[PDB]
Every structure is written in C-alpha cells, then in structure tokens.
Subunit: 149 residues, 2 copies
Amino acid sequence: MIIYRDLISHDEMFSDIYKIREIADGLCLEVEGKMVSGGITGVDIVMNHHLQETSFTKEAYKKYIKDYMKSIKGKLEEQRPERVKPFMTGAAEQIKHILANFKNYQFFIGENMNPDGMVALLDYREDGVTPYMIFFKDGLEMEKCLEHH
Amino acid sequence: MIIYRDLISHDEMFSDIYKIREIADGLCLEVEGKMVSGGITGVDIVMNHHLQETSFTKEAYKKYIKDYMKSIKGKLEEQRPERVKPFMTGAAEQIKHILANFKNYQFFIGENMNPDGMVALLDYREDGVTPYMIFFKDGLEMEKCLEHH
C-alpha cells in the first residue's frame, strides 16, 4: 500500500486503495471515492481516514490559504525548487476558482485538525453519486508500505 | 496505518481503517466493513483490497484447509511454538463450524489467488446490512506504516 500524508500536519489523507490521478498539470491529485450505506451514509475516503468537515468564511479561508501557500513554498524552496513557480502559479489559479465557487464544495481537514495543514475539497461526479476529493500534490508526502520486513 | 497481509501469499488482506477485534480466544480477527453503493454495490473490504470471491466443494475445501493448517503449523513451530496447540485445536473447531454452515458463508482469497494462501469468510451482522469478515490471526503478518521516514 501507499499512504498519502499531509506534509505539514502528518495526518494520513488517503491511500492507494482508491482510483487516483494527477490533474491540473501535476498540481493536484484527484481521489475517487465510494458512497457508503452501511451505518451512516457518507464518503468512504472521509470515514476511512477520519477527515473532519470544516467551515469558514471567505476572509478566514483567504487568511488560511495565504499562510498555507507560504508554508508549502518554503518547503519547495528548500527541497524541490523547480516546483516553486509551478506551485505558486497553479495554486493561485485553483484558489481563485475555489473562491468563485465557494458555496459549491465541502472542505475537509485531517483527523487532528491542525490549522497549518491542508484543506481538501469534496465534490461529486456528473452522475451525482460518485464522490471525489482534490488535494494539492505538493502538500503531500508518500509512504511506501511494501513489506519492509 | 497498519497493513494485515496473508503470511503465506503476501497479499494485503485488510488494514486498520476498519473496526477490528479479536474473537475465538485470539484465534481470529473480525473485520467490520461497510456496504458501498457508489458504482457497484459491494463490501468495501473486498473492493478495497481486491479480494476475489471463490468457490469449492466440501471435498476440495477439506483438502485445501488440511494443507493450509499444515503450512501455518510449520510456521508456528519455527517461530511461535506456544501458538501451535491453541491454533491446531481452535482451528479444528472453526473448520468444523464452517463445514456445518458451508452454504451460509461467502469465501474470499487474496487478489493473486494463491492456492496456498488464506481463505477468509464473509458474513453479515444481525442487522442484515453490516458486512464483516473473519481471518485466522495466525495466518496474518502485520506491517506498521507509521512514517518510517
């Protein structure tokens, strides 16, 4: 299995039990979930990794995402400088889209709700039933769990 | 995350995203799943780890489980001899129950369908909707995936 963790908060965000693909020129990972009927109707990604639904006002989100982008920029400068300009430019466009469509998404954070961690988006496919979630790829750290005996 | 793999086949059987408890005096792990409606109705454990439904006749199963018990006994003799008698005695009782209730379970094997690997059982809770699966604990190997940076 491969575990995808929030770079900043260390919370596990998802794993490769889901269909995953890169979107937005490598800026984002799209993670397709399943609707669960057993117990309480919900999105398996959210239940499985204990993601917490969150809310905020646009002014709060603007303050948060500016600091988040700074944190990721500093990590990319230190470790992968070739990603700094694509991330800053691509993320700015994604963030403008989010703010223009703000009431149309649900927002989730890792189980431990660290304010400096990543906020992920939940949307549904055009079939109205299939959920999927969007994450900043530069804000994730992979752990490969392949029988490190 | 913690990954539970078939000792013998190496296939991943489940992980600790599910509710897990020990049953039958430590002989078995019980793994509670969720029903999934998105796409094709099924049990998330089965879909997530690509478990394969299997069938057989009682005579085939009797031949298989006798060899499987031998394989696990040999592993316990070599590595955990204090488990040999509890496993052989406890498994014999579980197997008699399975054979007496043979048409009432669904049987699953790991993704790669190794004939020497573990066969897991799928049942439903008394609510008729909540699935759960039963595995021999002595036939599993844990991998702890906890940020081995």
